[PDB]
Amino acid sequence: EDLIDGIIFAANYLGSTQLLSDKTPSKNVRMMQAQEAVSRIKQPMTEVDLFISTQRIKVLNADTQEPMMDHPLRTISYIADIGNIVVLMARRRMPRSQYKMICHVFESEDAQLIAQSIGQAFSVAYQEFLRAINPEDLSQKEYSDLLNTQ
Numbered sequence: 001e002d003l004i005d006g007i008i009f010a011a012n013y014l015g016s017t018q019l020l021s022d023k024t025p026s027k028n029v030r031m032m033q034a035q036e037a038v039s040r041i042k043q044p045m046t047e048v049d050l051f052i053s054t055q056r057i058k059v060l061n062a063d064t065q066e067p068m069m070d071h072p073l074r075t076i077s078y079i080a081d082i083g084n085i086v087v088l089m090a091r092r093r094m095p096r097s098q099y100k101m102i103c104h105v106f107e108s109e110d111a112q113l114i115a116q117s118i119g120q121a122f123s124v125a126y127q128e129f130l131r132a133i134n135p136e137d138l139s140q141k142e143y144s145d146l147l148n149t150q
């Protein structure tokens with residue numbers, strides 16, 4: 001076989017928004033944060049390399065090759081692409097009972113491939129809960145809802 005364990009994409013990092021809350025943010029709140037982040041795109045940027053594996057997503061400065069963000073895959077709450085834009089949201093570590101959600105925005109010719117690569121690295125892990133129900137017995141609306149709350 002020719003299994004791929006990691007992939008790196010060039011992209012321009014446009015910046016991020018951060019949301020603090022006293023309870024984990026709902027789906028409706030996360031989608032509001034994602035739209036607001038996109039609506040801010042005018043435009044300063046940093047060239048980055050975006051590394052995706054089954055364990056984590058890391059953003060490296062392209063020029064220095066030093067990490068700027070390192071997110072374990074299990075903390076990603078949302079990934080989407082629209083045109084050349086990629087939006088990636090992650091729950092940041094906070095003391096107990098405080099919550100911080102970060103929404104990063106990138107631009108790349110490979111936006112759709114990047115979002116697809118993240119999405120599938122994720123739902124690979126999430127479906128690894130055969131040892132906790134058989135995903136293949138959940139409808140589309142059931143699995144989709146699992147991903148949006150769990």
Ligand SMILES: [Cl-]
Pocket residue numbers: 053054055056
């Ligand atoms: Cl890794």
